[PDB]
């Protein structure tokens, strides 16, 4: 597993430790997507929402997927590739989740759905990349997404993440 895989897992854990010491809301006020236009130049906020989790089990479940799928991208395609998927999906999954239902959300699962979509489509159109997603796991992923349509899931983060990963894998598959 590479530097970007590990750095992100450490970050999410450090931030979650702060959320236990200080309480959820205190961290949310400083890390959530800007709830007020005046705050709009607090640039960290467009990415920082990805680092917050509200359960130990929601953070165990996300770092697992992230280490599996993120580690695969870093190993096969490099650190720079994983940084870009991370940054774009975090920004765009946040943007869409905000419009669906406002700024009070968090979790890496937007980034995870982009990794699910990227690894799958890249492995299908471009097998020589040496990444792929089992059809079994694309099972999981699809049940998980539709289940949020009906636990208060950030539904716009999930679809926007997924879409982002598909588009990037599509573009990268042309080019490969």
């Amino acid at each position: 597993a590479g530097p970007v895989t590990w750095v992100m897992m450490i970050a999410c854990v450090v931030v979650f430790i702060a959320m236990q010491i200080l309480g959820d809301q205190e961290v949310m006020l400083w890390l959530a997507w800007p709830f007020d236009p005046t705050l709009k130049f607090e640039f960290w906020r467009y990415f920082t929402h990805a680092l917050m989790h509200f359960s130990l089990m929601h953070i165990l479940f996300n770092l697992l997927w992230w280490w599996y799928l993120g580690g695969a991208v870093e190993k096969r395609l490099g650190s720079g590739k994983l940084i870009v998927i991370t940054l774009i999906s975090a920004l765009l999954s946040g943007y869409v989740q905000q419009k669906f239902s406002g700024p009070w959300f968090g979790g890496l699962s937007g980034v995870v759905f982009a990794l699910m979509g990227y690894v799958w489509l890249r492995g299908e159109r471009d097998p020589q990349s040496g990444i792929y997603l089992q059809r079994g796991l694309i099972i999981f992923a699809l049940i998980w997404i539709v289940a949020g349509w009906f636990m208060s899931m950030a539904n716009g983060a999930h679809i926007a993440g997924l879409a982002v990963g598909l588009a990037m894998a599509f573009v990268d598959s042309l080019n490969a």
């Binding site: 959820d24 009070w104 959300f105 968090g106 979790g107 699962s109 208060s152």
Partner: peptide, 5 residues
Amino acid sequence: KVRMA
């Protein structure tokens, strides 16, 4: 509420 991504 808060939503979970």
